[PDB]
Write a protein that binds this ligand. Sequence first.
Ligand SMILES: CC[C@H]1OC(=O)[C@H](C)[C@@H](OC(=O)N2C=CC[C@@H]2c2ccc(NC(C)=O)cc2)[C@H](C)[C@@H](O[C@@H]2O[C@H](C)C[C@H](N(C)C)[C@H]2O)[C@](C)(OC)C[C@@H](C)C(=O)[C@H](C)[C@H]2NC(=O)O[C@@]21C
Ligand SMILES: [Mg+2]
Ligand SMILES: [Mg+2]
Lengths: 127, 117, 113, 58
Amino acid sequence: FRNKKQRKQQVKLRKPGFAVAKYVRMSPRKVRLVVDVIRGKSVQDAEDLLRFIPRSASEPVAKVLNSAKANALHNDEMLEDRLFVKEAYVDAGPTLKRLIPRARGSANIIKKRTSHITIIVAEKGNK
Amino acid sequence: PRAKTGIVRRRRHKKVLKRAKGFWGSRSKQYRNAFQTLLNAATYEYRDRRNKKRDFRRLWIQRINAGARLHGMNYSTFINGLKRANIDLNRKVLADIAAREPEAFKALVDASRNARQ
Amino acid sequence: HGKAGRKLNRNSSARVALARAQATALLREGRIQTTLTKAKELRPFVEQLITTAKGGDLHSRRLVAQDIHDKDVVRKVMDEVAPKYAERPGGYTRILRVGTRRGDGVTMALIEL
Amino acid sequence: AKHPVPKKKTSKSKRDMRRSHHALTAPNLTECPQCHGKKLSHHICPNCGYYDGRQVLA
RNA sequence: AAAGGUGAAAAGAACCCCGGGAGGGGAGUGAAAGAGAACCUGAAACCGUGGACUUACAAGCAGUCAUGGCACCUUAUGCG
RNA sequence: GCGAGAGCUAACUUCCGUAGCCGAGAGGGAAACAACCCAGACCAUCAGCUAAGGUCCCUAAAUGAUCGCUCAGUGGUUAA
RNA sequence: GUAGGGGAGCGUUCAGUCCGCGGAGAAGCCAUACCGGAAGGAGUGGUGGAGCCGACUGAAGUGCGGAUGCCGGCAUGAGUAACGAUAAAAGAAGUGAGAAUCUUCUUCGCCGUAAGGACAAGGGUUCCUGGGGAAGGGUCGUCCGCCCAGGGAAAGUCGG
Ligand SMILES: CC[C@H]1OC(=O)[C@H](C)[C@@H](OC(=O)N2C=CC[C@@H]2c2ccc(NC(C)=O)cc2)[C@H](C)[C@@H](O[C@@H]2O[C@H](C)C[C@H](N(C)C)[C@H]2O)[C@](C)(OC)C[C@@H](C)C(=O)[C@H](C)[C@H]2NC(=O)O[C@@]21C
Ligand SMILES: [Mg+2]
Ligand SMILES: [Mg+2]
């Protein structure tokens, strides 16, 4: 094993079949709805469903899935016909705050929330 | 010099927060409510310490005239006999005998009936 | 309750203009892509114009001219299309559903003769 | 001011409980007979443009 | 008004992949990229994903004490 | 509570005297209940005796013993 | 045992003295069933990546749950109210990664003592061209009064 210092140079820390769309200008809540259908499904169903879910979050999500697919293949040399959505989740990016005017002189703050859409693909393996 | 809070508060806060283990909602998550919950728990802790001491005697008394009645007696009566037969000072664990050893419990019922009549 | 029968998502004046506009477009083009509902509503009105034109006399033309304000379209419907549908026991106009649009998420459709 | 107003913040539980019915329903996608790229029932296949024969361009 | 901090040194990431881009994954640099330019540590509120035990006859300052059921053994098997 | 005035020999009224408790008093009892009854908590026990109160079942402990009374649910709304 | 009086101490920063520790891993953070009569204090592991416990004495900007307290971050209400005049719109063709929304054609409708046109005040490059597409645009933009670059403004007689 040695000590931490050595471990850091010996083992270099990998992200197999992981992709992330950081700072996506959409609300987590809203984006989650789409991701929620795609989770657990086989990367091909995931691909096909996304093309028909009539939500604008579909485009962002679908893109992450293709990055996760490409990464799984090209970088990690995984088997395409075995890929499935092992994990997908939407985490909250930083909020774009904006000042909206209301009646009688008072102001308000619009929260233009952002998303961190991460999807991780893996090979199935029943056996 | 300037003596800032830094560390003192957080340590004290995390302490209270850790007493709140399986407390519902905010009670296990926000300090003010966690600490607040514990004051009421304090009342409960001190009370129940001497309250369990009433609880068990009652469970024991219950198992006693349950057996005493099984042999045609009762608690008031059975304990009076065991008092009259001075020799018997059992009192504590007289319910284990009633629960686990019926044969042995009868012996005590029989002995109580005598010292009384 | 509400057991009537027709549609109107605008006001009298407009509901007419729309029907007449889409009627002129389908007859000009032969096929038009529109909202599914606007297409469902257009179907009976254009089918009715074909039957009027199937008369082939001045009165039948002028009646078409009341809803078809484009002179060239009225000639097309009168002398080209109605004749072709002579033996068709008035049915032709069909609706095909394309799928959901981006901006409003509305399912588009086709209406062809 | 703003006449009826909420009396207490609604708990993390309560809030999520009303969310039980928000879960989207995935399309019932069918395999296309003549280009196989999935389509919606009663709709023209987006890939080949068929609906028995080819109806739309591309 | 508010705002500080890569790395010892810019060696500031050539090249490849998904993407219009953003963003990411690799390759390489470096002691470390568990430092990548929204660059020291990175608490807490607050948002999620996963697992354990659980919950659709129940009246609830949300604990406390008692007991039973399940589960886990890194101040940790008499006990927790 | 007792002793008085004010008050209607009203008020969870007011104002003195006097004793106690609450205030600043937890614990048992009185269904619940500052004050009334019992009793003044240094800490630990899965020991024992009592107080006021209790002993059908909810709910600890006699569905006790003797002689009586009351049949109205009186007990479990006051008077001429 | 409330006001209150008295006693013994825990903890933080700074200082002086002693004893040490640290890149073979400091502080800080995170987890923990250990210890002490309390404030509290250790052991172990994890993270961090350069400082720092312990003891004695000295000094304080020295301990927070409250103040409709101050600063900041983030929740609830809730995917709710709204999206700023009820003067419309339709289709075709084009462009583009992407089009209800940009361009073009044909209709439609609304103003017409105006919702047309020319000044003054005021504004300050918003003008034209080519390009952009993060934010601004109550939606989307391939477009814009936005972003970048270049250009344009000509007086003896007009106004001073
Ligand atoms: C329109 C909006 C504005 O509210 C207002 O003006 C409405 C009409 C007022 O209502 C009233 O007066 N009435 C409502 C019920 C009775 C009373 C009333 C009484 C008599 C008459 N008589 C006739 C015959 O006509 C009319 C009305 C409001 C509600 C006022 O509150 C009332 O105050 C009373 C003193 C005590 C009342 N309670 C507590 C018993 C309380 O309800 C007041 C003072 O605002 C005036 C509050 C403060 C907060 C503001 O100033 C806000 C910010 C306003 N400022 C702003 O711009 O928004 C507002 C909300
Ligand atoms: Mg009388
Ligand atoms: Mg506060």
